[PDB]
Amino acid sequence: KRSVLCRESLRGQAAGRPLVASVSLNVPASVRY
Amino acid sequence: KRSVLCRESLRGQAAGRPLVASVSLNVPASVRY
Amino acid sequence: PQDLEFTRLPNGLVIASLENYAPASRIGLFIKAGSRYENSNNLGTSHLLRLASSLTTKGASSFKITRGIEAVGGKLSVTSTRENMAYTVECLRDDVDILMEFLLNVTTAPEFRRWEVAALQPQLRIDKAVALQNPQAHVIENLHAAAYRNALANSLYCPDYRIGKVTPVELHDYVQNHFTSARMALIGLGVSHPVLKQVAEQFLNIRGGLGLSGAKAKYHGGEIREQNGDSLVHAALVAESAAIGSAEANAFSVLQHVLGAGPHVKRGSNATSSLYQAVAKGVHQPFDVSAFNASYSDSGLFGFYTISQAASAGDVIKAAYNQVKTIAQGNLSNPDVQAAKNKLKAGYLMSVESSEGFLDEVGSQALAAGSYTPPSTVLQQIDAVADADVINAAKKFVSGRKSMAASGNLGHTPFIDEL
Amino acid sequence: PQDLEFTRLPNGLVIASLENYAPASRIGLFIKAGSRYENSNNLGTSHLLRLASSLTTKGASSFKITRGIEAVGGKLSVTSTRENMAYTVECLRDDVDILMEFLLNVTTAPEFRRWEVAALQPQLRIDKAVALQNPQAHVIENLHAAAYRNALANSLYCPDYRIGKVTPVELHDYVQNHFTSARMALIGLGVSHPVLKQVAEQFLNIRGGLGLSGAKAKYHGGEIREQNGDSLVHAALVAESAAIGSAEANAFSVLQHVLGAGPHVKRGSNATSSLYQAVAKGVHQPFDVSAFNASYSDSGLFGFYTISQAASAGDVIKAAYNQVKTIAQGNLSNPDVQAAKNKLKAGYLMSVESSEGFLDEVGSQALAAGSYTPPSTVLQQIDAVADADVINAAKKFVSGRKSMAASGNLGHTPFIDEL
């Protein structure tokens, strides 16, 4: 968990073709937009 | 878990004064309507 | 022989008593704290409070408390409602006094010690797990949080994320604000009122206004859906019932019973239950359906409950609706209302045919009204319901904001727009 | 040097290729199976499928498959969304053949062994757990399940109650019905199209029509609310956006950006962001907020996301709304649309300035249209949006069925009726 106290917040989702694209790879792994 | 396959189970809630009354006791414990 | 005897004091706490014939006496202090009295920051506190009844308190150590009641064969049960919290106390005629002093410590002298409260914590999970074994509880809970927004939408069991986070000042605060004089009602089933009062007067005088938790009501239609892997699916469909102890309410209750399907016969099927008949005809072989009826101080919830299998969920669900629509279209013959009524009347009487039942009934009334309404009177009120009245109420479910909760494989469960 | 080269076969699978200069080639078979393809009885099987990509298949044992790619320093990514499932495969120019024969096994020859699939199961929880660490994921997820009723309201992550219950036949059936010729698009970033085709022809010819899962769209306004103990609260407010690759949609995108607050500057505040400005003025010091914009084949979701504190939740939430109301009242000057536009254009270009980006963009388009639209053309389309058009689309949010999802202490979070 990472503290979200300041102005820094800048997360909200909206891309061109992809939207809420979840990756699972044999090596790496993640969640985008 | 008790199987609820047949015409036997009617359970539905609605009493006079009490409605969904939950009781906790050392001797006993339960959930009524 | 002697009938009950209520008495409102200067504090505003009620107290009743019935010296019965038989050997067993049972006190029970009903404090007005339900689940509805917690906020976003205080949720789960009554739950823990309910489970922490045997902890050390100012005059009696957790050990003495427990060992003491055991000594004499007594039982200490706390009943918690979304609106109220009955703290029951059974024992033998001779031992009330040893027992009462226990009830008083537990309730007015709790000492939540960091270490003691902490070891409890884990109990919450164990308790939640065992009551979440009946679909009825998670659905019925899901229902209340969907249908309400703020107060009664709070559930009786502590939210998974809160469990260990329940802190001792929380418990202390909750007791202090809610476990007070104005919100209390003593009730004895085998004690002297004269001696009861004295005690009441000596130990139950604490100040605390209502709503330091955030009291208020509000209904909001909403749907909570919980997918499972279980063959069977349960769902509840419910619209703002009428409020507690009011005519509309009462009407609802009677209506409830015209459809209400709580079997009165072992292995027997209802002939009387309309819902069941109608559902049945359009439904498969194995299925279970029951009417639902809840009434609280500042709002209610009326509608039905279904238990269908995967593919049958909708068919049953609509079926049941359609039938209750019928009564709302006006279609309801006199012969069925009178049956209903008598069904109800018989039930309320059997409800109170036991000590435990009676004691609940009485305390219950003391927190609502302020006095004991006798059975007869009760019986009269239910009879006053008009055959139309019932229809009219019914008209209100069909034409009242919907709010549903289901569990299981939801491929075939109607949404709000589905019905 | 050579631009891409699409080719629809008799099967209906799409294939592209770009012999690039640089050392790194990356194949990616995008099969059309998103999370929207499961039913009440099938939910969580894409999730498991996503996580089972290294299991034994017909030609290659789990051991060979993983040690094989290691051998050569490759990576095998299996990405999925609610509509699609990209199976990525990176590796060195010289090793694509060793690698491709891996992708083919993994995708057309899966052998889900009771024992192997059983070991995985627990991985689902671990995976779910780590992804649910970001409030964004559970809220975003909850959003989809409230705004939809049937297909796109299915989440990406296996439902808690299903985890161990995802059976082998389930995986085998999902592959079979969805991992088929008509739904597939090969895509190379450093491979020969001539040699790609050959292979595509030899290995990707399988039959399976759409919707054996139960395809169809539908939007339904709803609110899912998750209480927590966390100071901060997140909430989404969204109404039906326009569909994928349509004019309305595009419009939305451009409007999105007029308010859209994804910081373009480290430690920097937006001066451009209307939402931010407006919110900011009526809001406290610490907060953050952004325009949300989703578009899928058969519906969209447009609206904003908020991150406030417990008592600001409303203020923020409304503030945001009000401002987006402003644009729908007509109030929007030309200067801001052109900036927006150029913001968007810039964005798209950067989005495709990477191999991984490009390869996604390409595949993506393959599944929607059936060909590759060049960037330029893309760019033209976005420009065509009218300054009014934007407003008009914005009109639609304000006058479109609302659907919201929040987390945290929800004392101060507006309900539907609140706004």
Substitution target from B2, B3, B4, B13 for chain C, most C beta carbons within 10 A: B13
Q: What is the CA radius of gyration of chain B?
A: 13
Residues C99, C146: Cα–Cα separation, whole Å = 41
Longest Cα–Cα distance in chain D: 63
Cβ atoms of D224 and D299 within 8 Å: the answer is no
Residues D286, A5: Cα–Cα separation, whole Å = 6
Q: Which residues contact C213 (CB under 8 A, 6 or more apart)?
A: C33, C36, C37, C38, C39, C42, C174, C177, C178
Whether the CB of C105 is below 8 Å from some CB of chain B: the reply is no
- Out of A12, A15, A20, the one facing D351 most closely (by C-beta) is A15
Given the structure tokens 């069991």, which residue do they identify? C157
Q: Are strands C14-17 and C184-188 parallel, antiparallel or unpaired?
A: parallel
Q: Is D79 in contact with A21 (Cβ distance < 8 A)?
A: yes
Nearest CA among A14, A30, A25 for reference residue D86: A25
Q: In what order do the strands lie in the sheet with D299-308?
A: D223-227, D404-408, D233-241, D299-308, D288-296
Closest-CA residue of chain D to A7: D286
Give the method used.
Answer: cryo-EM
Q: Which residues contact D38 (CB under 8 A, 6 or more apart)?
A: D44, D45, D46, D154, D174, D213
Residues D359, D369: Cα–Cα separation, whole Å = 16
Q: Would you tell me which residues 17-76 of chain C have a C-beta closer than 8 angstroms to some C-beta of chain B?
A: 50-51, 53-54, 66, 75-76
Q: C-alpha distances in angstroms, C343 versus C273, C313, C336, C349, D389? A: 11, 29, 10, 10, 64
Cβ atoms of A9 and D288 within 8 Å: the answer is yes
Three-state SS at C186: strand
Nearest CA among D151, D99, D157 for reference residue D126: D157
Cβ atoms of C317 and C413 within 8 Å: the answer is yes
Q: Which residues contact C118 (CB under 8 A, 6 or more apart)?
A: none
Which residue type is seen at D216? K
Residues in chain B: 33
Which residue type is seen at D60? A
Q: In what order do the strands lie in the sheet with C184-188?
A: B29-31, B21-25, C75-81, C85-92, C24-31, C184-188, C14-17
Residues C188, C210: Cα–Cα separation, whole Å = 25
Instruction: Please give the DSSP secondary-structure letter assigned to residue D54.
Output: T
CA distance between the termini of chain D:
55
Supply C197's token pair.
Answer: 């009062």
Residues D1, C99: Cα–Cα separation, whole Å = 93
**Phi/psi-derived region of residue D44, left when phi > 0, alpha when psi is between -120 and 50, beta in every other case:** left
Q: In what order do the strands lie in the sheet with D184-185?
A: A29-31, A22-24, D75-80, D85-92, D24-31, D184-185
Cβ atoms of C77 and B23 within 8 Å: the answer is yes
Supply C243's token pair.
Answer: 């409020």
Residues C227, D149: Cα–Cα separation, whole Å = 13
Supply D57's token pair.
Answer: 């298949």
Supply D363's token pair.
Answer: 């595949």
Other residues' Cβ atoms within 10 Å of the Cβ of residue D315: 19
Three-state SS at D289: strand
Q: Is D51 in contact with A21 (Cβ distance < 8 A)?
A: no
| Domains of chain D: residue spans and CATH | 1-207 (3.30.830.10), 219-419 (3.30.830.10)
Chain C partners within 8 Å of B20 (Cβ): 81-82, 140, 144, 294
According to DSSP H, which parts of C156-269 are helical? 168-178, 193-203, 247-259
Q: Which residues contact D351 (CB under 8 A, 6 or more apart)?
A: A15, A16, D357, D361
Chain D partners within 8 Å of A7 (Cβ): 269, 286, 288
Cβ atoms of A16 and A23 within 8 Å: the answer is no
Closest-CA residue of chain A to D70: A27
Q: Which H/E stretch holds residue D407?
A: strand D404-408
Three-state SS at D384: helix
Which CATH code for domain A1-33? 2.10.210.10
Chain D partners within 8 Å of A24 (Cβ): 50-51, 53, 77-80, 127
Q: Are strands D75-80 and D223-227 parallel, antiparallel or unpaired?
A: unpaired
Residues C361, C379: Cα–Cα separation, whole Å = 14
Longest Cα–Cα distance in chain B: 34
C128 phi and psi, to 5 degrees?
-65, -40
The structural domains of chain B, with segments of one domain joined by +, span 1-33
Q: Is D348 in contact with A16 (Cβ distance < 8 A)?
A: yes
Chains that touch A (3 or more CB pairs under 8 A): D
Residues D307, A10: Cα–Cα separation, whole Å = 10
State the resolution, in angstroms.
5.4
Residues D212, D32: Cα–Cα separation, whole Å = 13
Q: Which H/E stretch holds residue C124?
A: helix C123-131
- Bridge-partner residues for C27, per DSSP? C89
Q: C-alpha distances in angstroms, C239 versus C83, C236, C320, C401? A: 19, 10, 14, 6
Q: Would you tell me which residues 2-31 of chain A have a C-beta closer than 8 angstroms to some C-beta of chain D?
A: 4-29, 31
DSSP of D108-175, one letter per residue? H-B---HHHHHHHTHHHHHHHHHHTTSHHHHHHHHHHHHHBSSSTTS-SS--TTTGGG--HHHHHHHH
